[PDB]
Symmetry: D2
Subunit: 344 residues, 4 copies
């Protein structure tokens, strides 16, 4: 049996990993066991005090996040803020499958990392976005996964097919709305319900958001040209969901762009291209590992437009982690990962 | 193979039955086929124009609700407004399993039906609330099921253990908040998003709500005493969820009340009694077939208080329908019905 | 010119006092000036860092909450958590008008205060609910005001006319839903947007909420029967608004109850009795100082039902404070207090 | 006295005009009277059945929308869907002040109008955006006003100072989120609460939205350069508010751009440039006629970023209508128009 530990089990990403594992077929038949659940200060509390939706695990006592407690598990999810997985990965048995939700091993340019995160670059692990060209093969049998950030997942799925086929200019604009669970459950006044309800605001604008270079990195993997990214995130009064509106200049006809998206995504089970006349909505993908995508051309503005909707906690985090865990373990990639949303 | 038709497939309850069937183990192993999907004016359209979250069924063409279309199915869900079940059930075989989400066959007193619904009584079918004393036995192998209303489900789960144990007075008060999907997807000005968002309102107050006699009927099934029900529903700015606050006068001690609930619900897989110090929240049960329940005693007011949270679309209707379907077909009662909520 | 200080200016109640003062006619004609704005940890920041909606005051620097800073003001609003007004009030001049939004001076029974607040009783000041029988006369020319809690404001307006006329039994039940701004802006995980959005929950149930004795106290002021209060508050996903559903057994006819509410409220400018066939909604009173009320009789359950909607930050706090301020200073009671809501 | 009629009084824009008129100083001192309130199918009903927040007018009976009904009024607000206004305005006296919230008289190019609205071009009236260069001159003493659309108001305020100073390129991108009251109150399934709540969706993308040429026309008024507009609107689960994220290739450093916005807006009472390190939020402007603006430069992407927040119903429509009314009547422009938002 694959014994699984979750570090950061009391946070939003850790809770969603547990939700997905509880529903995974390997948990049903005993090939996957849910072992130690650890955190920082929540140690000693029961899991139900943080995740009342996870009633089968509510009685579990949260433990300290120490190598000894996380030891003895074949797979370890790290659902912590960036800064801990580098040292934590080193203390663990190297045979252990380590799936890091944080950013520590995402970036391939050490100088880019130091500019945006202000610490020593730890390195890079296989990127947990299996639909990216080349990425799936690197995850088969791997023992190290860097799960993508939520906004990059939406932006890259929206944009890479057009850019890989040289059908748009490499200067892209991304304005993405997001529910507030993407910010984590650490209490701040700016994330308070009364503040968030009934309001929308852009934040970390004009290149300072740390996902900007992660989008750039993913796009550079499919083109020769110099990539620039204008990325604006906008917080909206929903708990989950990302709707990324992505634009770039183009002179290619719509029919060519449509065919490029059909070719890239016809055999990708989690990507759904909208029928003609329909557009994505975050409500349709909530609680699923799906991305819903539509493309169009603004002829007057000579601008390509791609819309992508994902659940930030599933395809944008925990579902990507479980998807990559499946590939790493040699299990069917779709195990435990529904494409069906929970709407309305 | 059990072939299933869903009448009212384009509505909220029909869409949620379909979501649950797609995840049901009998669908996965071919024991259950999803057959004809019918409606009224939406006949001729594709299901994706109504339920974009159900992408595996998006291509299905909605058919007319006609006995010729519903025939040849081993099971037929009726997810229609009340008024059509009697005729449709007359036209289907007695061996066909018919599961009615509407009210037509819920009430056992013709005079009560006439007073609250203004029409002749159709009769009554086994009530699809398996947790009620005596209900499960009536549902095993049955071919006719009347699924309960969503508010009675919450209220009856909150109250019947105390009342059946003679630990409270039979004059009960229920004030229940509900998300707006409980009203259905028919477009009215009062259900418009701009109206509902940011606002709460009680409606159909002081005994005019048709679920009042349904609550009373379920309580009279566990006591000979003179039941009265003060029921106030309150619409709140959520899409799903019912939180029923239920009260009754008592002089019994809390210890005896908690023991009554633990005895009644210990072996009930969908009922979760909150640990000491915790209270239910609708967010914890969304997308699950669970009910979360806590009880307390207000000594100064000599008042018993029971709180119950359910998802109105799952345990409040479509999950109850599939739960009853499982019992009717001799399948494991929990098949396809998770207790794990989709939160936050 | 009346110089006004606000202690706790960085909080929700303090911000709403300032919003109302900015729109008060005395502010427009110079009779009223907004002086010191004080807090605790927030001292040293600008007001716009806390209340970006108050742009005319955004540049104001928040000052420490000290007697020296607060001195030299004709009126001082205290918008602090309970337990600080006694120590702060005793350091101001007795001729200073002190208006306390907290509970410190609301309760008239020292033993009840100690039970529910766990500290020594400070005493009691004129209660800032002018519509209560006898209350308005105690406020005229006063220099001490204890502003009521938000739930008691709704429950008392819903219930006192029936109880004062001996038309209902004195055992009352109140189930009130509230937007999340009633909990204050101090950051807790339970108040985070992702948690409160899409979810509802009762809290502090079965008589432990500190507003239970405050409701009982107001009701005891209109009757000599023994009062008891079953009070359940319910957090819902809105930022503002309280909808109180209040019930009591009755043997009086509806016409008599209706007449008692018309008599009590016909001359009350902030109280609006719903037209026949209409019911209150919190969205209709947001941003106004109004209460919208309807009453009914559940004949089958021999139960009176009263529904009251207020804005918890206006008539439930800062509007009541400004309303009482007007009375204390001899200004027209409605000055700066609109009855028109901001909907949708 | 100025007698005012409102056509389309039962809708969202008409109701918000009435809210502002009720708080206008001319209404308080008798110089403005609220006369005929008209609609289509809601004629015969009372206004309270549509706008329960407008309790001082709740008793008013809605009348049919006929030119003879609207005659005899010194000022007429038209808050109807496109069409109607032209036919109605032709039958009204040329000495009547007509303020049209619809699009009929906004556009100055008949071929553009035909292409996006599919009807004959009625002409064009002075555009009701007083902050636009040259606009205030045209509004003084005018008897005809075309009020701008909500999204163009936000986009033009965000972009025109940069473009007028030739500091950015004329190919602009706008992605704007909007609360659902922008869609009007006509009941459709796509606007119902359960659909809108918890979901976000772009609509009318890639140049098909009718506000695209309106944005382009406003920008052409400040540059003789060729303007292109990529405009994407996104519906979010709020009832009010527009947050426009506007980008363009930059040819300038932030200091020059900030200075240009300071110069353009320091005089403007409704336009608030955010302090250093603060960004707009729609919650801060709800219920006010304010727009909050911030600008930035993404150096790595060489992209100018401008964020604008307004209330879609106030500065986006009814507030702009009343603002232009003041100017046309020779009244103080800010009369009845607060800059203070109703937050949280
Ligand atoms: N949330 C998303 O949508 C999303 C999407 C993509 C990627 N991610 C990434 O996933 C990671 C988790 O984010 P989140 O949203 O889940 O935040 P969160 O809800 O606040 O949870 C953070 C968890 O990490 C634990 N923790 C914090 N510091 C710790 C320390 N020194 N040692 C051990 N445990 C510690 C916390 O334990 P305590 O309870 O004791 O504090 C908590 O359980 C982040 O790195 C994020 O970048 C998140
Ligand atoms: N929604 C809940 O939370 C809930 C909970 C418990 C019980 N129920 C009960 O389940 C039933 C469905 O409620 P709902 O929320 O799903 O309403 P809904 O969303 O508005 O949809 C109703 C469905 O019934 C179809 N329909 C209406 N009239 C029909 C007719 N003459 N012939 C054939 N089909 C017709 C409609 O087809 P078209 O699309 O063509 O109109 C539609 O698909 C109700 O009786 C309700 O009491 C609902
Ligand atoms: N909010 C409502 O709906 C409502 C309704 C009715 C009555 N009330 C009552 O009004 C009062 C304020 O509630 P709230 O919702 O506004 O809470 P809040 O949003 O969290 O703000 C509390 C304010 O009090 C300040 N403060 C806290 N401790 C202080 C201390 N030792 N010394 C000086 N200032 C201190 C805080 O300043 P810092 O920012 O520096 O911490 C803050 O500005 C409460 O007593 C409440 O019971 C509230
Ligand atoms: N809503 C916004 O945020 C916004 C912002 C900027 C500009 N505008 C513009 O303002 C106008 C009103 O939009 P809205 O949001 O208020 O829509 P709405 O909420 O649906 O109301 C539309 C109003 O127009 C009336 N009406 C409809 N058809 C009519 C007809 N043949 N004859 C007479 N009256 C008719 C309606 O009366 P009945 O009740 O009888 O149907 C109703 O009162 C639109 O042109 C819009 O472009 C709106």
């Amino acid at each position: 049996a694959t014994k699984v530990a979750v570090a950061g089990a009391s946070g939003y990403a850790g809770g969603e990993i547990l939700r997905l594992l509880l529903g995974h077929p390997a948990y049903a038949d005993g090939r996957l066991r849910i072992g130690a659940l650890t955190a920082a200060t929540s140690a000693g509390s029961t899991l139900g005090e943080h995740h009342p939706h996870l009633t089968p695990l509510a009685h579990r006592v949260v433990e300290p996040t120490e190598a000894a407690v996380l030891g003895g598990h074949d797979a370890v999810f790290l659902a912590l803020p960036h800064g801990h997985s580098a040292v934590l990965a080193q203390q663990l048995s190297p045979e252990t499958l380590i799936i890091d939700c944080g950013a520590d091993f995402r970036l391939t340019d050490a100088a880019v990392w130091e500019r945006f995160y202000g610490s020593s670059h730890a390195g890079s692990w296989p990127y947990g976005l299996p639909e990216l060209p080349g990425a799936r093969d690197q995850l088969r049998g791997t023992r190290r996964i860097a799960v993508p950030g939520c906004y990059p997942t939406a932006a890259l799925l929206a944009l890479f097919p057009a850019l890989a086929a040289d059908l748009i200019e490499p200067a892209v604009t991304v304005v993405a709305v997001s529910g507030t669970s993407g910010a984590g459950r650490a209490a701040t006044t700016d994330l308070l319900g009364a503040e968030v309800i009934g309001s929308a605001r852009a934040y970390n604008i004009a290149g300072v958001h740390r996902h900007t270079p992660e989008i750039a990195q993913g796009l550079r993997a499919v083109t020769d040209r110099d990539v620039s990214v204008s990325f604006t995130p906008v917080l909206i009064p929903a708990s989950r969901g990302i709707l990324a509106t992505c634009t770039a200049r183009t002179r290619s006809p719509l029919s060519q762009l449509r065919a490029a998206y059909e070719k890239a995504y016809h055999a990708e089970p989690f990507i759904y291209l909208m029928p003609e006349g329909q557009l994505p909505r975050t409500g349709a993908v909530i609680g699923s590992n799906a991305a819903h995508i539509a493309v169009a051309v603004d002829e007057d503005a000579q601008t390509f437009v791609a819309i992508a909707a994902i659940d930030n906690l599933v395809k944008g985090t925990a579902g990507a982690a479980v998807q990559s865990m499946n590939l790493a373990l040699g299990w069917p990639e779709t195990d435990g990962l529904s494409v069906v949303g929970v709407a309305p």
